[PDB]
Design a protein around this nucleic acid. Structure first.
Length: 181
DNA sequence: TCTACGACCAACACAGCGCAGAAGAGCTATGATATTTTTATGTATGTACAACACACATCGGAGGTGAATCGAACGTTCCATAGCTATTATATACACAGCGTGCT
């Protein structure tokens, strides 16, 4: 067991609004709406109360990023869809699928990263020239982990909570064995 | 008037003519020779042919080269496809570039 549970910091989800959207009008009429078709083929909006960000496409496909919890992402998608209703489009809410749940935690001890890369070499790839963190790719569940010398752990690539939590619980014994000073 | 010159006589002897023999002038006949006739005999001529050997223009094969003609490599363009590029949120942490400031 571990005395600390990871805390989430970003949830990436998608919603199908089910209607063709004219990105020209939603940029002009919505308040915080940025449309640069040369730079990107979507309109970026963000609203203050969930601190999220919606990438809205012409086909009606939607991306919600920046949420802390699944209910927060659901509420953010609800309010962005309500904005699209108030702007003059028939954007029926159809589905809501959360793809990414990245959460960070701290084991509060220094880690010997080279020894961990040497021991669990089939799942790890340490290249401190490029990035100062170790990339651990767990096979079950499919969660990737960024491991650092300060003990900070970044778990990325979860669909719901019961992957990142058990990923941390499985990665804790193989990091408790590596301690510096 | 008369003196040169011619008649006249004798002797004779040497020229002159009869006679016979020679001889040769001129005609006549016959053989040899050169001249013309005839023919005949070989030669020349226009034009054609053929046989044969050599030489030469003409046709044809061997070789060389410009003009013409072939492939082959390559650049370019298009159809379709797939793979990539770009954003955003977020924790984490380190390395480098760039800019505001200030005080040495």
């Amino acid at each position: 067991t571990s005395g600390i549970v990871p805390t989430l910091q970003n949830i990436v989800a998608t919603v199908t609004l089910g209607c063709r959207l004219d990105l020209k009008t939603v940029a002009l009429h919505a308040r915080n709406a940025e449309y640069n078709p040369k730079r990107f083929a979507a309109v970026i909006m963000r609203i203050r109360e969930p601190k999220t960000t919606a990438l809205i496409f012409a086909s009606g496909k939607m991306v919600v990023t920046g949420a802390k919890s699944e209910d927060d992402s659901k509420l953010a998608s609800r309010k962005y869809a309500r904005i699209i209703q108030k702007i003059g489009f028939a954007a029926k809410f159809t589905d809501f699928k959360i793809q990414n749940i990245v959460g960070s935690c701290d084991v509060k001890f220094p880690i010997r990263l080279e020894g961990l890369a040497f021991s669990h070499g089939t799942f790890s790839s340490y290249e401190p020239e490029l990035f100062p963190g170790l990339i651990y790719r767990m096979v079950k569940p499919k969660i990737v982990l960024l491991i650092f010398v300060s003990g900070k752990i970044v778990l990325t690539g979860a669909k719901q909570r019961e992957e990142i939590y058990q990923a941390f619980e499985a990665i804790y014994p193989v990091l408790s064995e590596f301690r510096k000073m």
